């Protein structure tokens, strides 16, 4: 899952 | 250079990474963690799921519950249980903390765990810190006990940091 943290 | 979150409609810049959002693998839109009712803990855990588990927004999710929601729920319980079994299987800590004589001991932690009542990493860790610190406060100045309690304390902190790197176990209100 892509997040701003990824 | 940007777009709007499909749920709350707040704007965002494509190059702004100072926010808590997930990008839908199908429409490429970014959605706020808050717009999926996700706590900061869950956002951190979601950020750590495998790349094969894509986030999908409400508009692009065809099957409910979305696959990422199922993976997230399971990952949290698995991670928690991981720490709990490691403590239950640890001879020294089990010795001193599983059975005593709201969770009063690790056995109480398990009943809570099994009943599916643990959602918060902070609450889970707090329950265990309480049990460890309680043992420490009642070491009775007995040195072999102290060495023992200090060891299970470091073991717990290491288990927590490995399973939950983003979480500050050392900041627990219950350490004295
Ligand atoms: Zn939003
Ligand atoms: Zn989408």
User: Which CATH code is given to the segment(s) B3-54?
Assistant: 3.30.40.10
Strands B2-4 and B11-13: antiparallel
Nearest CA-CA distance, residue A4 and chain B, Å: 5
Expressed in percent and rounded to 5, the helix, strand and coil fractions of chain A are 0, 15, 85
B2: DSSP letter:
E
Of B18, B22, B71, the CB nearest to A3: B22
Q: Are B54 and B25 in contact (CB under 8 A)?
A: yes
Phi/psi region, residue B116 (left: phi>0; alpha: psi -120 to 50; beta: rest), is left
Residue B144, Cβ neighbours under 10 Å: how many? 8
Cα→Cα distances B149→B38, B64, B103, B108, B135, Å: 36, 46, 18, 19, 7
Gaps in chain A following residue numbers (C to N > 2.5 A): none
Sign of the C-alpha dihedral computed for residues B7, B39, B61 and A6 taken in this order: positive
Are B138 and B104 in contact, with CB atoms under 8 Å apart? no
Nearest to A1 among B17, B18, B46 (CB): B46
B126: Cβ contacts below 8 Å, ≥ 6 apart: B172, B173, B174
User: Contact, B35 vs B8, CB < 8 A?
Assistant: yes
Residue A3 to residue B23, Cβ atoms within 8 A: yes
Give domain limits for chain B.
3-54, 66-172
Helix axes B67-88, B106-114, angle to 10 degrees: 160
d(CA B22, CA B35): 10
Ligand 1 centre from B12 Cα, in Å?
9
Question: C-alpha B86: how far from its chain's center?
Answer: 15
Do A3 and B21 touch, CB atoms closer than 8 A? yes
Superfamily of domain B66-172, CATH level 4: Bromodomain-like (1.20.920.10)
Looking at chain B, the residues that come just before a C–N gap of over 2.5 A are 101
Is-same-fold flag (B3-54; B66-172)?
no
SS3 B62: coil
3-state DSSP helix/strand/coil % of chain B, to nearest 5? 50, 5, 40
Half-sphere exposure of B86 (CA within 13 A, CB side): 16
Chain A partners of B47 at a C-beta cutoff of 8 Å? Answer: 1, 3, 5-6
How many angstroms is the resolution? Answer: 1.9
Q: Which residues of A touch B43 (CB under 8 A)?
A: 3, 5
Q: Can you list the alpha helix ranges (DSSP code H) found in B89-165? A: 91-93, 106-114, 121-137, 143-163
């Amino acid at each position: 899952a892509r997040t701003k943290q990824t | 250079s940007g777009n709007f979150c499909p749920l709350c409609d707040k704007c965002y810049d494509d190059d702004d990474y100072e926010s808590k959002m997930m990008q839908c693998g199908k429409c490429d839109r970014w959605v706020h963690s808050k717009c999926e009712n996700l706590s900061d803990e869950m956002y951190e855990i979601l950020s750590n799921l495998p790349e094969s588990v894509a986030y999908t927004c409400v508009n692009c999710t065809e099957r409910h519950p979305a696959e990422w929601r199922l993976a997230l729920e399971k990952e949290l319980q698995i991670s928690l249980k991981q720490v709990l079994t490691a403590l239950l299987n640890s001879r020294t800590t089990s010795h001193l903390l599983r059975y005593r004589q709201q969770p009063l001991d690790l056995e109480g932690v398990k009943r809570k765990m099994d009943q599916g009542n643990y959602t918060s990493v902070l609450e889970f860790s707090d329950d265990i810190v309480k049990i460890i610190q309680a043992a420490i406060n009642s070491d009775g100045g007995q040195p072999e006990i102290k060495k023992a309690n200090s060891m299970v304390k470091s073991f717990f902190i290491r288990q927590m940091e490995r399973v939950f790197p983003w979480f500050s176990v050392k900041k627990s209100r219950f350490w004295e």
